[PDB]
Amino acid sequence: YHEDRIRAKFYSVYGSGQRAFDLFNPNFKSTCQRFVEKYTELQKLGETDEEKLFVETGKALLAEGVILRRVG
Amino acid sequence: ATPSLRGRLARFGNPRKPVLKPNKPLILANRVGERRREKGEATCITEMSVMMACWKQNEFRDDACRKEIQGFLDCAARAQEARKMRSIQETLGESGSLLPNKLNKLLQRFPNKPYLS
Amino acid sequence: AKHLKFIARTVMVQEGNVESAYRTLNRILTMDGLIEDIKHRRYYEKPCRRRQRESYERCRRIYNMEMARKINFLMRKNRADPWQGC
Amino acid sequence: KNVLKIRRRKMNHHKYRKLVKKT
Amino acid sequence: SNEDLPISMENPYKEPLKKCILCGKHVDYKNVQLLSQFVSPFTGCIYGRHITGLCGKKQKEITKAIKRAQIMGFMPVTYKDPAYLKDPKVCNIRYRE
Amino acid sequence: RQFSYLIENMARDCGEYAHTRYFRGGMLTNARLLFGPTVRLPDLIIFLHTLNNIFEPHVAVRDAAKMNIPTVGI
Amino acid sequence: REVLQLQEEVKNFITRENLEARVEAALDSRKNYNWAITREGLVVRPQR
Amino acid sequence: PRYELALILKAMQRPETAATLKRTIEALMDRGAIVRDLENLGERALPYRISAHSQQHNRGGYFLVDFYAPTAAVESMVEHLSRDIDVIRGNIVKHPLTQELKECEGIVPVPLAEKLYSTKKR
Amino acid sequence: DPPPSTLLKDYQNVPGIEKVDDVVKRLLSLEMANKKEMLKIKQEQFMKKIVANPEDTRSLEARIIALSVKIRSYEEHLEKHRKDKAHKRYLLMSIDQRKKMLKNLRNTNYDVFEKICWGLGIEYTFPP
Amino acid sequence: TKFSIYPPIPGEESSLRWAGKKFEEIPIAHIKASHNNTQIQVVSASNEPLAFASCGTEGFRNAKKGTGIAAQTAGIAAAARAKQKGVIHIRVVVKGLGPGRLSAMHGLIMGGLEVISITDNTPIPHXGCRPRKARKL
RNA sequence: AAACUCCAGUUGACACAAAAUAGACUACGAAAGUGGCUUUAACAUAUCUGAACACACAAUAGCUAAGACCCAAACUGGGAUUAGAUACCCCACUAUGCUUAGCCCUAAACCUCAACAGUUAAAUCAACAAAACUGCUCGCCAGAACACUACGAGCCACAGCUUAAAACUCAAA
Numbered sequence A: 001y002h003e004d005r006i007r008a009k010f011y012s013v014y015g016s017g018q019r020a021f022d023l024f025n026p027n028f029k030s031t032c033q034r035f036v037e038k039y040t041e042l043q044k045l046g047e048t049d050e051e052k053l054f055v056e057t058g059k060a061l062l063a064e065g066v067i068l069r070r071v072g
Numbered sequence B: 001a002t003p004s005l006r007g008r009l010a011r012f013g014n015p016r017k018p019v020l021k022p023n024k025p026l027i028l029a030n031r032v033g034e035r036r037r038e039k040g041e042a043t044c045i046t047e048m049s050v051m052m053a054c055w056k057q058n059e060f061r062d063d064a065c066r067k068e069i070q071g072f073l074d075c076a077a078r079a080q081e082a083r084k085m086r087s088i089q090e091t092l093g094e095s096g097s098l099l100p101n102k103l104n105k106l107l108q109r110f111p112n113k114p115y116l117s
Numbered sequence C: 001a002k003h004l005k006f007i008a009r010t011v012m013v014q015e016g017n018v019e020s021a022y023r024t025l026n027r028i029l030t031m032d033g034l035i036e037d038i039k040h041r042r043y044y045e046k047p048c049r050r051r052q053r054e055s056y057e058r059c060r061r062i063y064n065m066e067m068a069r070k071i072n073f074l075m076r077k078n079r080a081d082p083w084q085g086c
Numbered sequence D: 001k002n003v004l005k006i007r008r009r010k011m012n013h014h015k016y017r018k019l020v021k022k023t
Numbered sequence E: 001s002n003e004d005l006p007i008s009m010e011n012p013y014k015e016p017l018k019k020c021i022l023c024g025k026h027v028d029y030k031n032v033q034l035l036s037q038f039v040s041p042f043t044g045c046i047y048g049r050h051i052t053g054l055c056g057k058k059q060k061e062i063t064k065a066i067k068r069a070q071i072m073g074f075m076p077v078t079y080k081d082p083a084y085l086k087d088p089k090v091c092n093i094r095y096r097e
Numbered sequence F: 001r002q003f004s005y006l007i008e009n010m011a012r013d014c015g016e017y018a019h020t021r022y023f024r025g026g027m028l029t030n031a032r033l034l035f036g037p038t039v040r041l042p043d044l045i046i047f048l049h050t051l052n053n054i055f056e057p058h059v060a061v062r063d064a065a066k067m068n069i070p071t072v073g074i
Numbered sequence G: 001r002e003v004l005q006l007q008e009e010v011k012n013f014i015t016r017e018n019l020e021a022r023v024e025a026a027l028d029s030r031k032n033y034n035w036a037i038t039r040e041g042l043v044v045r046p047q048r
Numbered sequence H: 001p002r003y004e005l006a007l008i009l010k011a012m013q014r015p016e017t018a019a020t021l022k023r024t025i026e027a028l029m030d031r032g033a034i035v036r037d038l039e040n041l042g043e044r045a046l047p048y049r050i051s052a053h054s055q056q057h058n059r060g061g062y063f064l065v066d067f068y069a070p071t072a073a074v075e076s077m078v079e080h081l082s083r084d085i086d087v088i089r090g091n092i093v094k095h096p097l098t099q100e101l102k103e104c105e106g107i108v109p110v111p112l113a114e115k116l117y118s119t120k121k122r
Numbered sequence I: 001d002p003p004p005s006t007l008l009k010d011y012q013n014v015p016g017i018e019k020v021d022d023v024v025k026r027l028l029s030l031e032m033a034n035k036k037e038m039l040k041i042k043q044e045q046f047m048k049k050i051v052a053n054p055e056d057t058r059s060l061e062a063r064i065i066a067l068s069v070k071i072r073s074y075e076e077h078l079e080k081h082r083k084d085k086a087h088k089r090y091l092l093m094s095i096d097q098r099k100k101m102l103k104n105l106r107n108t109n110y111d112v113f114e115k116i117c118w119g120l121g122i123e124y125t126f127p128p
Numbered sequence J: 001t002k003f004s005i006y007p008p009i010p011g012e013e014s015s016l017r018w019a020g021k022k023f024e025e026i027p028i029a030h031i032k033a034s035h036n037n038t039q040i041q042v043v044s045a046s047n048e049p050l051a052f053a054s055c056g057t058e059g060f061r062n063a064k065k066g067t068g069i070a071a072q073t074a075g076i077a078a079a080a081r082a083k084q085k086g087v088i089h090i091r092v093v094v095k096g097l098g099p100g101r102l103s104a105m106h107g108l109i110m111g112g113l114e115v116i117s118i119t120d121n122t123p124i125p126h127x128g129c130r131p132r133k134a135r136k137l
Numbered sequence K: 001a002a003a004c005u006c007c008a009g010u011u012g013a014c015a016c017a018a019a020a021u022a023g024a025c026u027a028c029g030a031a032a033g034u035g036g037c038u039u040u041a042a043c044a045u046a047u048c049u050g051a052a053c054a055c056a057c058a059a060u061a062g063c064u065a066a067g068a069c070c071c072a073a074a075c076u077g078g079g080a081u082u083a084g085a086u087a088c089c090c091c092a093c094u095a096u097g098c099u100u101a102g103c104c105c106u107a108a109a110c111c112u113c114a115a116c117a118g119u120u121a122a123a124u125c126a127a128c129a130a131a132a133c134u135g136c137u138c139g140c141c142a143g144a145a146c147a148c149u150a151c152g153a154g155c156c157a158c159a160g161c162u163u164a165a166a167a168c169u170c171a172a173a
């Protein structure tokens, strides 16, 4: 899926979220999926650059109180 | 890592000469070999030579070789009990790796499948 | 002959333990293949015979390493039967 | 395969070389 | 048609290929310190790639460099130069129990 | 074997039959000798698992076709 | 671009004029080609 | 082409070593070589005892001479080094910096070979 | 053979190569290169002398010229290495391949076939 | 300091001593373990012969020379003559995979000598002379 | 047992011989072959197929001539074994293995699987071996044995090689 490129980059930058997946809940949303949704919203607002659209998404989540610890 | 088998055998499509000429097909059997019976080392042979050394210098008189004879006797008894325990522990407990019989039962449940079903 | 002496194949003895030092030396010569090399050189192995031996030893390594990989892969399954009676 | 066909040729050749040497 | 159908593309999660410790570095026959890291301390024997962890290309370059350095008077043959015994151990082999 | 107990109870509850055990040679193709000349064979066989425990097709799949018994199978 | 680079390098080549001066300058310097590799792929230059 | 002369000289004092290097560099120029640089690798103990010109050597001075020369100059220079009594051992190799190292993408894994035997039942 | 002072085929058309130091001209000449660089110069001379388009290398004419240069290099090699059976094979095969090329050129473009024979000094012969 | 199985390199400053002598000054016991015999020679660091013994010089003959007990007896004989000349510590250099390879070293220890290092010098040609043909048994 | 005892061990000096480890790599070459180091030259062909004989090659053994000689080693001699032992085992030593210049032209020279192009679906397929096939071309084969033979012919080959039958015989091989 198109969002797989966003997930591959998120896992490479921020690693697997210390929050544990709950695959029993059919509506579970991980930190990566919450990142993918914000990334998708900003892309529909006109932004097309990749490197720029990825840095703005991280800021939006930090403003919402999400923990994003860069792996390196 | 297992050495490669690509282009090693004489086959159609493989241009080069064969690298390997296995006299048996390289296909895993559903069993392993039986562990060979091993020959242990002699025990107390050091104390045996010390005893037989005093005999040569004391005309084979046991009265002068008591400490050497006793040492060779105590060692033989200790080596006897240890030999008695080595069987109870190593033969039955299967310490470390499994025995062939037990390992073959495990392979029976996951046999190699060189054919289609 | 032209090299320095007491560097190659030399092991120091610790606390008078000569047996352990000899076993260490023998283990070194074995792992580096010198022992088997010396034995195979007592008589001349003809080239066709050496090629056959190398092929046999290489096929044995491939088979033994694949059997070992399957044993380690299945060893976890040696636990107790979880559905005893069914 | 056995080597019975080779063995027949082997003896033929041996006896021929020996005949040539003798004469 | 449908937006939720899969799309054809290359594996985005694909991990980069692994590289040997010498990938991208020049192997010179004069760099005896580097070459000494791939020979036995006791016999001077060259280690196979299953011990050195080198790829095929670098296992060959190291081998050729050692043979050149040995006969040109830069490197001993029957042992590892004792001056290099305290270098980083990059080979997978242990002689002591 | 993880579901043997579940399947045997389901069969007993719906009023049908279950065979989750080791399948002996000829239960279907030699039934008149194993059960009797008047034994009635199943009209339908439902495989909840079509493989045996060495990851081969259950022998009953072949033998059901030999005896012309329709089979449902996951 | 290769002819330009080569034209600057030739200025530092040895000739029969500066041979005696370049030999003495070599006897005073030291060139070290030794370096070790780590399990992480990092070069460890020699302690000099 | 571009070559590299690995030169092991007899352990001598500075004056005799300078006279040997000059005499060697001139031998290259007399054969049409364009000498590029001279590097001193320092005096050290030889990896093994070397016998050269009816003498046994345990130490030597290591020097490198980077130079260009026609292909026909190598054979003639090798013959010259064999007669110089102050040279323990001298080898001429193609300069390693001329050989451009190709790029490497990494290690491509090798999968277990398949279909080496027909799938008939044995 | 071209003079040793001839520049390599790669550095012959760089602007300002005639105003560089004499040392730089030696390092870019045939004198400081292997024999294969000299053969590329010979091949270029024959092209401009014979073929109509010296830039077309896939024509049957360019191939006959390229192979004729290889044939001459094998003959020079064997003059010094008379027991080199491998290169003796490469020579005889190359001569056979050129004869097959000449046969195909003689059948398709005779005017070009005559210029090739004159330019390269080849005496065409019919097989027995 | 942790124990080092690598021998001390001559020229470097090592703290190891044996009766006040450095590693380079310890006498050497050369053991030649052949398939049919064992020869032991003790020499000084300056290559001065100090003692010699073999299974043959100790009264063994024919197949009895190629045994471990014969090599042990030769080791005791060489140690006895070497100990009289003031030898205590020795460096063992053994060549050959004969039956008296390890037994010869035991005899040296039983004779009163202390082995501080063991060195193998079994000749291995790196390509050399063609050995004799294989046996038909 | 014979053999050696100007023998053996350490140390030093010291090859016209052979090329540990790397190589668990699978590369190069038409094949035969090719795994110590350096340098020079250098690995045909922009359709494919195309030869017992043309053309050029071709392991080992062998021949001719001149050299080298560590080690190995047909033959031969000695020791032992055995009913015998022209063998197997031990020792010694030669032709030979090496170099140079010419020959000889053979191999289970077999990965016993011809070159080129294409396929994995149908009937998948006697057996075994290394799954089954298609197009196209050249080479070759037609019961066994006689027969890697006889004769003829060619060949630097003269107890050789290549090509290669028939009669008598059997109902199998």
Ligand code: FES
Pocket: E018, E019, E020, E022, E023, E024, E054, E055, E056, E057, E058, H104, H105, H106, H107
């Ligand atoms: S993986 Fe790149 S050189 Fe080894």
Ligand SMILES: [K+]
Pocket: J126, J127, K019, K036
């Ligand atoms: K070698």
Ligand SMILES: [K+]
Pocket: none
């Ligand atoms: K043939």
Ligand SMILES: [K+]
Pocket: K108, K110
């Ligand atoms: K074969």
Ligand SMILES: [Mg+2]
Pocket: B023
């Ligand atoms: Mg077989």
Ligand SMILES: [Mg+2]
Pocket: D001
């Ligand atoms: Mg058989």
Ligand SMILES: [Mg+2]
Pocket: D008, D011, D012
């Ligand atoms: Mg017959």
Ligand SMILES: [Mg+2]
Pocket: K023
């Ligand atoms: Mg090997």
Ligand SMILES: [Mg+2]
Pocket: K050
């Ligand atoms: Mg053709």
Ligand SMILES: [Mg+2]
Pocket: K051
């Ligand atoms: Mg024909």
Ligand SMILES: [Mg+2]
Pocket: K052
């Ligand atoms: Mg023929």
Ligand SMILES: [Mg+2]
Pocket: K058
């Ligand atoms: Mg031949």
Ligand SMILES: [Mg+2]
Pocket: none
């Ligand atoms: Mg010959």
Ligand SMILES: [Mg+2]
Pocket: none
């Ligand atoms: Mg001999």
Ligand SMILES: [Mg+2]
Pocket: none
């Ligand atoms: Mg001879």
Ligand SMILES: [Mg+2]
Pocket: K098
């Ligand atoms: Mg030679």
